[PDB]
Amino acid sequence: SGAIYVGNYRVVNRHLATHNDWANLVWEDSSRDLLVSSTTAQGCDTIARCDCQTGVYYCSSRRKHYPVSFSKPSLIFVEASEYYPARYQSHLMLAVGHSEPGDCGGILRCQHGVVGIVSTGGNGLVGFADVRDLLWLDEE
């Protein structure tokens, strides 16, 4: 579990969005596993605007933050998980590291701020849904 809070937006894994998220929907994209809902309070997080490929992510199934190198966001085949069938996920970054389903929502951060959230795992990789392209998270 976990979310990003920026401005009056909450960014969550689409597959973990609640009824309240859907009832306050701003934007969602199944291909990316992302959903954004509106908040009443202002968020604590800063979104990175960069092409960093090094950062640190939170792994809840280890109670640990790990430094990782990760690939640039791309269209990647993901094997079946507890929450999605095998499919192509867009805007996905991969790193070598531990990730189980419940690790979804852990933040990946670089020197500039939040890069994305854990979205995939298995076979010794962790996948992150990028958010650095979503410039609108900082306005309106």
Residues involved in catalysis: 15, 33, 104
- Could you say which DSSP state residue 47 is in? B
Stretch 67-106: interaction string toward Zn ion, x if CB under 5 A: ----------------------------------------
The reply to whether 52 sits near Zn ion by the rule CB under 5 A is yes
Q: How do strand 107-110 and strand 54-59 relate by DSSP bridges?
A: antiparallel
User: Which of 110, 114, 134, 137 touches Zn ion by CB under 5 A?
Assistant: 110
Residue 44 annotated as binding?
no
130: nearest Cα among 108, 104, 111: 108
Cβ proximity to Zn ion: between 87 and 112 the closer is: 112
Rounded Cα distance between 130 and 26, Å, is: 17
Cβ proximity to Zn ion: between 25 and 50 the closer is: 50
In the numeric block, the tokens 């990730």 are attached to 99
The H-assigned helical ranges of the chain are 19-23
The reply to whether 48 sits near Zn ion by the rule CB under 5 A is yes
Residues that bind Zn ion (CB under 5 A): 48, 50, 52, 110, 112
